[PDB]
Curated annotation (Swiss-Prot), chain B:
Modification type N6-acetyllysine: residues: K241
Record keywords, A-Z: Acetylation, Ribonucleoprotein, Ribosomal protein, RNA-binding, rRNA-binding
Oligomer and partners: Part of the 50S ribosomal subunit. Forms a bridge to the 30S subunit in the 70S ribosome, contacting the 16S rRNA. Interacts weakly with S6 in one of the 3.5 A resolved structures. In pull-down experiments interacts with CedA.
UniProt record similarity statement: Belongs to the universal ribosomal protein uL2 family.
Residue ranges with Low complexity bias: 38-47
RNA-binding as UniProt keyword: yes
Gene Ontology MF: a single term: transferase activity
Additional detail: This protein can be partially replaced in vivo by its H.marismortui (HmaL2) or human (L8, from the 60S cytoplasmic ribosome) homolog.
InterPro entries, per database record: NA-bd_OB-fold, Rib_uL2_dom2, Ribosomal_uL2, Ribosomal_uL2_bac/org-type, Ribosomal_uL2_C, Ribosomal_uL2_CS, Ribosomal_uL2_dom3, Ribosomal_uL2_RNA-bd_dom
Record function comment: One of the primary rRNA binding proteins. Located near the base of the L1 stalk, it is probably also mobile. Required for association of the 30S and 50S subunits to form the 70S ribosome, for tRNA binding and peptide bond formation. It has been suggested to have peptidyltransferase activity; this is highly controversial.
Region of interest (Disordered), residue spans: 27-52, 220-271
Entry-linked HAMAP family: Ribosomal_uL2_B (MF_01320_B)
Listed name of the protein: Large ribosomal subunit protein uL2
Record organism: Escherichia coli (strain K12)
UniProtKB/Swiss-Prot annotation, chain C:
Record field: transmembrane: none
A single MF term (Gene Ontology): structural constituent of ribosome
Species lineage: Bacteria, Pseudomonadati, Pseudomonadota, Gammaproteobacteria, Enterobacterales
Coiled-coil residue windows: none
Protein name from the UniProt record: Small ribosomal subunit protein uS11
PANTHER family: 40S RIBOSOMAL PROTEIN S14/30S RIBOSOMAL PROTEIN S11 (PTHR11759)
Curated annotation (Swiss-Prot), chain E:
Quaternary assembly: Part of the 30S ribosomal subunit. Interacts weakly with uL2 in one of the 3.5 A resolved structures.
Stated role: Binds together with bS18 to 16S ribosomal RNA.
Single GO BP term: cytoplasmic translation
Domain of life: Bacteria
Protein name stated in the entry: Small ribosomal subunit protein bS6
Modified residues (N6-acetyllysine): K93
Family classification: Belongs to the bacterial ribosomal protein bS6 family.
Span within the parent record: 1 to 100 of 135
Secreted listed as a keyword: no
GO cellular component: cytoplasm; cytosol; cytosolic small ribosomal subunit
Primary gene name: rpsF
Length: 70, 271, 117, 88, 100, 55
RNA sequence: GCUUGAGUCUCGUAGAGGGGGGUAGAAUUCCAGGUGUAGCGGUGAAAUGCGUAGAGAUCUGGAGGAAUACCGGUGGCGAAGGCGGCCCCCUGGACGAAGACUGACGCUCAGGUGCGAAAGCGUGGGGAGCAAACAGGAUUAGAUACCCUGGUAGUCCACGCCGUAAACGAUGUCGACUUGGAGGUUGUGCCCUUGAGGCGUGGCUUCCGGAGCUAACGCGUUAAGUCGACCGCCUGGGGAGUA
RNA sequence: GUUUAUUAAAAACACAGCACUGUGCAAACACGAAAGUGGACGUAUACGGUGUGACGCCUGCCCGGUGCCGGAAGGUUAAUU
């Protein structure tokens, strides 16, 4: 991630661009991913759980929006 | 190929042979032969200078062209034949002008292949060019230490030299031993590895096999008396000494190289 | 002595310690300061505050060079990732560009095994 | 698989006409044409097991087709094998 | 006898030899009954990343149709020619002659 | 169909740091994304596109 | 005899299918040198360890190995195991379009043969990272562990052997039949200007559900529903997949 | 297979195999005041030294001591001045 700051740009907005540009690239998330080895079985299992959660989340949300609570 | 002998008798159970059907079954090239006599480890004083040498089968030396100065004349490999004088085989080549010579057989060479020597030769195995014109990172064998002196490196059965760097007038070579050495770019080298890479897989199998090739038995220093060897004797099997050579020099670790002349060319030692 | 006007600041943010170093555009180190050596040990150095203090000590270590322009190089995660950079404002230092240089391998080397805590 | 031009020769050489492609003779000849051609492939690609699995299918199909010809017409079967130089 | 797409970058100091190399390479294929379907000299261009401490390279395009051996034997020449760096070849099913 | 030499269009599907934008964002079809990726990787090798912003 | 099962041919399509070779970038480690100075690293805390013989940090150059970020997706391919940079050579299979051809050539399969993760073994290489064993420092009543700093085999390549996994969908293979809804992926016909459209027709695939089935949980056109062909296997627990 | 010719033929020596270590070629090493010679008309799949001793399953822990290897900032230290 690269950000170029001019002479007239106040630091507050310039600083936030780093927090919004680098974080968008996922540097803080990618680095944590390679800190320790997730064994290939773990990768498939966690990805499988995420996929189930992603699909189940929409199913759960869609049904709830059509169901009254009070 | 490697063949394991069937255990039809002791001394034949453990014998492993290297059989090359491509080798010529007939007599060698007579005009390129000469007589070399066994010395038995004796120098001009008659004293045993090096031990464990003696006997063995009679051998006839064959002039092997280690220089390869025939430039611009293509040659064809007539045949591959056994060489008793070295681990590698020798390929008989015929220059189209009518001259025959012996060269070390590269890895993939076979009868009828095209080989050329010179500065403008193609980049193929068996071709000899100065390392100035040879691309870096290419495997070569039979490298000369000095221009025009003849190859002296990577001559064994499966040995080879890797050209790693080329800086100015010197080329740094990764020798088979693992040490890096500097040689002039004008020295010649032969592309490709040396043939008969299976020479290391053979097993002599029996004591007589070593004797056939002129290797006399080696006697341990422990079994010696104190007068003969520093390891000496002792009632029973006693050692109680730092291992040394029969002339008292410490062995098993002691560095021995003391050549201050050419340590400039040794960029890095083997280990 | 050299009186360089433009410099380069390297932030080696890490989960344990934060190292702040100031170097010219050519990468020749001028001065450095670290959280561990700033009176913080153990859990103390790990906090973001230790990162900002280390930045302050870095400014004094290079005030004799009289540098004005700075390049903030940031590597690795840690609470000192953002605290240290903001500390340069307390010193009034001027910067020209900010970039992320955290190593991101394309697989390759074997990462160490997980810790069964 | 097999070159289109090479396939054309076999269908005409072994088939009744240039349009009869389903005849048991052309199928056996076509399978034999590919089977022997793969000797060079497996001469040096010895561990290429996955494609060898397809080769054994060709061998099995050829065996099945030949047995069918034997039950239908023995005389016609004999001519096919001698011309193709198989069943050794 | 298939369609091929060849791209090769040469040392900028050798920008004066590129017309010569094109003729030699084109001659080799045409001698084997091949034919060139597209030729384009892209000029010196800025490199995305440095190669061997070098930042500018001369780009050319060469889409050809020739037998296996001539390209195979052409690859080996590409290897030892120090002027050319990082050449690529590709397989295509139909000849293409576009400006691109 | 997508050509690696069609370099003008490639930045529309890569970020500043050289990331390849996922299909979920760009909305490209699955088939085109596969060939698009091959084109991008092909261009990067020829130094036409950068692998990353650091070199 | 016949053409609907099965198969052949022509034209195309997608794909980490496989084997061989080459090459590219990021990163770690190591080596050399420059800037620079007292810490670095690590943990819940700490120590062992590394460092004034100049570490760590930072820059330049070089050597070498291994794996391919983003793309990337209950996405794709393969009989299974399994297979992810890019490029070339050799090659298996699947699928669609219409047309032609052969004319039951089919299904299953004891024994048999082949393939078969990881670990392991044999020989010869290679070895950056990681890491059984091992060593030390912690923790604890003890700690032959969990944690930390090091670290060998191994992990990699060539060829052979081993033939075992929760080798799982805990569900043998083939064929027919039986209400649906929402997606993914890959072909194809038609309507076409009212397209980042509209209606059909195939392959593979994910999720939820009807009848029915089931001890229940659940399965549910990809059946664990309704049938047919063939094979494998089970007969209380332990002893024992042991002698 | 070898050995105390002339009281010991053996479990001793050798042995193929294995391992460590030295050696980049004017190689190490060895015989020579030296020239030179062998190793070798060989070139690390080579050669020397050492221990073990086919093959099979294996070869654990300790570097304080002695030796060897590497570094060497510092202390001490010869001729010379
Ligand atoms: Mg000897
Ligand atoms: Mg011996
Ligand atoms: Mg005795
Ligand atoms: Mg005793
Ligand atoms: Mg750690
Ligand atoms: Mg077929
Ligand atoms: Mg069976
Ligand atoms: Mg394994
Ligand atoms: Mg092994
Ligand atoms: Mg550990
Ligand atoms: Mg089982
Ligand atoms: Mg599995
Ligand atoms: Mg499963
Ligand atoms: Mg089962
Ligand atoms: Mg259901
Ligand atoms: Mg048993
Ligand atoms: Mg006697
Ligand atoms: Mg007697
Ligand atoms: Mg003994
Ligand atoms: Mg021991």
């Amino acid at each position: 991630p690269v950000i170029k700051v001019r002479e007239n740009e106040p630091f507050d907005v310039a600083l936030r661009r780093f927090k919004r540009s680098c974080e968008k690239a996922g540097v803080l998330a990618e680095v944590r991913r390679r800190e320790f080895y997730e064994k290939p079985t773990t990768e498939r299992k966690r990805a499988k759980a995420s996929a189930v959660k992603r699909h189940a989340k929409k199913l759960a949300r869609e049904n709830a929006r059509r169901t009254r609570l009070y | 190929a490697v063949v394991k002998c069937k255990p039809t008798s002791p001394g034949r159970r453990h014998v492993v042979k290297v059989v090359n059907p491509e080798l010529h079954k007939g007599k060698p090239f007579a005009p390129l032969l000469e007589k070399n006599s066994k010395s038995g480890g004796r120098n001009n004083n008659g004293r045993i200078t090096t031990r464990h040498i003696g006997g063995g089968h009679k051998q006839a030396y064959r002039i092997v062209d280690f220089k390869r100065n025939k430039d611009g004349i293509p040659a064809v490999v007539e045949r591959l034949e056994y060489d008793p004088n070295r681990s590698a085989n020798i390929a008989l080549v015929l220059y189209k002008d009518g001259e025959r010579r012996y060269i070390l057989a590269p890895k993939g060479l076979k009868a009828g292949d095209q080989i050329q020597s010179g500065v403008d030769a193609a980049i193929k195995p068996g071709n000899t060019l100065p390392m100035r014109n040879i691309p870096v990172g290419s495997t070569v064998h039979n490298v000369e230490m000095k221009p025009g002196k003849g190859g002296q490196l990577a001559r064994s059965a499966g040995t080879y030299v890797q050209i790693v760097a080329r800086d100015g007038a010197y080329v740094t070579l990764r020798l088979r031993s693992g040490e890096m050495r500097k040689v002039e770019a004008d020295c010649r080298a032969t592309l490709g590895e040396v043939g008969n890479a299976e020479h290391m897989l053979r097993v002599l199998g029996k004591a007589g096999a070593a004797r056939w090739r002129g290797v006399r038995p080696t006697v341990r220093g422990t079994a010696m008396n104190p007068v003969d060897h520093p390891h000496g004797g002792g009632e029973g099997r006693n050692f109680g000494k730092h291992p040394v050579t029969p002339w008292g020099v410490q062995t098993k670790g002691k560095k021995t190289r003391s050549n201050k002349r050419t340590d400039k060319f040794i960029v890095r030692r083997r280990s | 002595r050299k009186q360089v006007s433009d410099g380069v600041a390297h932030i080696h943010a890490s989960f344990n310690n934060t190292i702040v170093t100031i170097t010219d555009r050519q990468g020749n180190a001028l001065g450095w300061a670290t959280a561990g050596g700033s009176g913080f040990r153990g859990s103390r150095k790990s906090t973001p505050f230790a990162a900002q203090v280390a930045a302050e000590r870095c400014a004094d270590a290079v005030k004799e060079y009289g540098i004005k322009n700075l390049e903030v190089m940031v590597k690795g995660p840690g609470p000192g990732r953002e605290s240290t950079i903001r500390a340069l404002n307390a010193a009034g230092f001027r910067i020209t560009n900010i970039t992320d240089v955290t190593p991101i391998p394309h697989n390759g080397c074997r990462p160490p095994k997980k810790r069964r805590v | 698989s097999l070159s289109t031009e090479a396939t054309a020769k076999i269908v005409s050489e072994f088939g009744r006409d240039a349009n009869d492609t389903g005849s048991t003779e052309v199928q056996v000849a076509l399978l034999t044409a590919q089977i022997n051609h793969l000797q060079g492939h497996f001469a040096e690609h010895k561990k290429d097991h996955h494609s060898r699995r397809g080769l054994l299918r060709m061998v099995s199909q050829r065996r099945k087709l030949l047995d069918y010809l034997k039950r239908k017409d023995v005389a016609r079967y004999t001519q096919l094998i001698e011309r193709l130089g198989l069943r050794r | 006898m298939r369609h091929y797409e060849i791209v090769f970058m040469v040392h900028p100091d050798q920008s004066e030899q590129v017309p010569g190399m094109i003729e030699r390479y084109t001659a080799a294929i045409t001698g084997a009954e091949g034919k060139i379907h597209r030729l384009e000299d892209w000029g010196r261009r800025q490199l995305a990343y440095p190669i061997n401490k070098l930042h500018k390279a001369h780009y050319v395009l060469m889409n050809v149709e020739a037998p296996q051996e001539v390209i195979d034997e052409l690859e080996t020449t590409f290897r030892f020619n120090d002027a050319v760096i990082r050449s690529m070849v590709m397989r295509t099913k139909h000849a293409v002659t576009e400006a691109s | 169909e997508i050509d690696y030499k069609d370099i003008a269009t490639l930045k529309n599907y890569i970020t500043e740091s050289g990331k390849i934008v996922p299909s979920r964002i760009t909305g490209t079809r699955a088939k085109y994304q596969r060939q698009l990726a091959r084109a991008i990787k092909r261009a990067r090798y020829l130094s036409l596109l950068p692998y990353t912003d650091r070199h």
